[PDB]
Amino acid sequence: TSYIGGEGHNLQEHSVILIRGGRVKDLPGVRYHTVRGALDCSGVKDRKQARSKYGVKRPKA
Amino acid sequence: MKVRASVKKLCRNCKIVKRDGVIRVICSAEPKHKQRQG
Amino acid sequence: IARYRNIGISAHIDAGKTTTTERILFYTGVSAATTAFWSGMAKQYEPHRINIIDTPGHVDFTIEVERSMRVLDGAVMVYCAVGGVQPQSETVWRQANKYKVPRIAFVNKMDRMGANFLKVVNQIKTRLGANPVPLQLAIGAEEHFTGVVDLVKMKAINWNDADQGVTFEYEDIPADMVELANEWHQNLIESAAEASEELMEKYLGGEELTEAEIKGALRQRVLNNEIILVTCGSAFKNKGVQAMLDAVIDYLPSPVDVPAINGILDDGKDTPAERHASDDEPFSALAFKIATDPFVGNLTFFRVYSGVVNSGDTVLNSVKAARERFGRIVQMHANKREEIKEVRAGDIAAAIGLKDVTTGDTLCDPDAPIILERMEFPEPVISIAVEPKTKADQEKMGLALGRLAKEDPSFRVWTDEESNQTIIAGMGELHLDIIVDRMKREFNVEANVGKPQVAYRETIRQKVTDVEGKHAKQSGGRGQYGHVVIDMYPLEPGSNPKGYEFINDIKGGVIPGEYIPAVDKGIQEQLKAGPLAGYPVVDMGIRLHFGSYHDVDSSELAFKLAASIAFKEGFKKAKPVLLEPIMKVEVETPEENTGDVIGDLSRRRGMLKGQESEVTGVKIHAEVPLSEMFGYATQLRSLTKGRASYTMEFLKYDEAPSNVAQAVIE
Amino acid sequence: AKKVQAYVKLQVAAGMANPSPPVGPALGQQGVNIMEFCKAFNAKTDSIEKGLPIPVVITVYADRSFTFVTKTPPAAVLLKKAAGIKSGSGKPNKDKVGKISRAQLQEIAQTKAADMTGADIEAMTRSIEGTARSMGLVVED
RNA sequence: AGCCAGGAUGUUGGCUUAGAAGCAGCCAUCAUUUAAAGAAAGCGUAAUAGCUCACUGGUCGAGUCGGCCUGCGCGGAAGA
């Protein structure tokens, strides 16, 4: 199981995803996480900070 | 070729004939009126 | 640059196309980018490199033709002598005039019984609205055809054919047929003087024209799209094949003889700049095909228009903003992958192993601004879902359709966030199943296909007022006491922005105010989960009059629980009914289809909503429910000579009958 | 009088140019393309008055001749402007749906007496009386 | 009853005008001349056209046409 911690979602019931490490301590059972910016899962639009996470693609200038 | 037990005209070109004893009805408007026995 | 020849043999199904191509390949010696060579009298018999763009067979999937049209500079329009011009023959004509690319017409099946050349010519002029020019003419009838008379050079060639139709003999026109065939000899001198009035002086002066001048007349009109050329032919009994290419080398343009593209830019003062026909200009190309070879790799085709490339440079492909690199360039002789490192301006190549090359990317080798081309605009007509026999074999064909939505721009996919299976989309019956077959044999996923489900909304109708819900679950130390008397509406359809409304209607101090928004959010949880069919509900504006509460039993989870127990009865007491999603369809059935199509539409429970008559188009608009819409365009092309299509848009809902309520089943 | 060479018996809705919404595809399916018609139609419709209905007696044929005959408005839609009630019902005998005095029918069909030729004046208005009484807008002399 | 010739419709008559333009269905079911002719009996048109009926106008040139009641048969009516 995973967690898509963040304020967007796109994925679908039958998309392919990626997995990284990260625990929760709110969810007994989760010990992984999503990778947004990567493959067929879109990042959250206009979250300027922590942009190395979540793949916002540097809001222009 | 309806083998119905009663023939009655449905077009106006229908005629009732006497061929070989068997009563029949033809029509040349819609040749779907052709029947027997009636 | 003057020598190259980018040709496209596009044709209706069963016309002769595949069999024609083999007679090109077998002659020129002595996939999608097959190369050739020939030597032509029009350009003093220097060698001329034909680069045959393989045109798609199923021209129904119009997108692949549209890419093909641009990359070809010339086109042979193969036709059928017995059947005249065809439905898809008029279809490929539409794509060709769109990109202005001129053609030559090819009357195949001359050997076949019932062959008249004049049939096609009449059919050319009548339906397609062209001014055809007869180049050569059959000596004799269907079986008796042996002779080809090039009336431009006023010579003749026969065939006893003696070794596969290659060796030939010189004749003149025999006495029995001079006079009636010289009517179209008279047609040649009059249709060749409006481009330059110097040839007008020879007709009203009495100077009979020689061989090379009339080519100077006729070629420019097949450079500026005024008249087309019609040559005779027969591939299957190989009579007329030598002069067939000598129709192409005398009339059709070359990469220098085509107008350079007036393509748009993306920088500065947004002015149109050229991509000239000079061989030493800053390079730009356009990738059109992606094929995975058996054992050569991921072939990344593209057309070499203008400039020099020394292979092994970086590319500034500014439609995706990524810099890729080259493996090779490949050109096939028969399908013979004989290698080359030289990228000549006017050739076509097939590069290898480029990762993220889609279909329709305008790439630039010396990192210049592109001549930007955006051309992926046919739209698929069918929404049919799939069912692969394993979900691990589903995302592999979801990778293969993820490849097929990356190789061919209108065979896209639909990711369904809502219903567990995806949609394959096409413009025709056959192009859907050939990719089902290609993923059956090559990509190896067999499919027991299934039809999709429908969006299925609801609405209520009765004016119920009272309905309440109590929940006195005390039972212990700390419990839950809620009471929220609700009321609803058979709400107005499309005046409000959202399909449900809510308003505070408290009489006194009978409820705490903080729970009152939370009641609306609880109904917002409990709207879209309907107890009728498991399908989401819309169209009621719920108001709330009476209430109650407690000191110790004041969990707000109670003030969202019993609001559904008030809406368990409240759903149950206003006699609801499902809403069917109604489409808004329009279809242009030209003239001899109207009785069929409207009869087709009325059987699909649609209503007559008027029509117009633009110059040929009798276009009928209607509204149609989505219940039985599995395969409309296949039902439409069957009764319309496969000409018409449809493009719709979902707009509204309406009262469903009980048989759609008989589709509730669960 | 012709029957079919380029003939239609329609196009009475003259509230707006380019008559494609009320009549539309019958004009475009029967030869008479609108590109030279409406360019010539406001050379003959602006000559009299606007806001009227018009029966087009189109004496046209295949070799691009728009020779034009016009008439007084038809008795179905003459009374739309002549009565001033905008009520054309379908129950004539069941209920009184409007009022005309017959002298009002005289002056609006003294134009029909000048335009159309039935026999003579009171008989030509007598031909219109049953057409008027087929709607519900009854006439009271 | 047939052969030659019209079908004597102004008018697209409302509605619901999106097509219901004699022929979807509901209302009216008028008047041109009323020698034949209803704003309509039918096939047939997405909608017209078109094919024809009503009426035999002229010709032909004698009976002919639709029912009521009965005598007698026909079809209805296939088994090892």
Ligand SMILES: Nc1nc2c(ncn2[C@@H]2O[C@H](COP(=O)(O)OP(=O)(O)O)[C@@H](O)[C@H]2O)c(=O)[nH]1
């Ligand atoms: N008699 C005759 N048959 C032909 C001729 N050209 C092609 N055919 C036949 O038509 C069939 C299909 O032609 P094909 O090349 O596959 O057309 P394509 O599907 O458009 O590529 C072949 O089996 C040929 O035998 C011709 O000139 N004469």
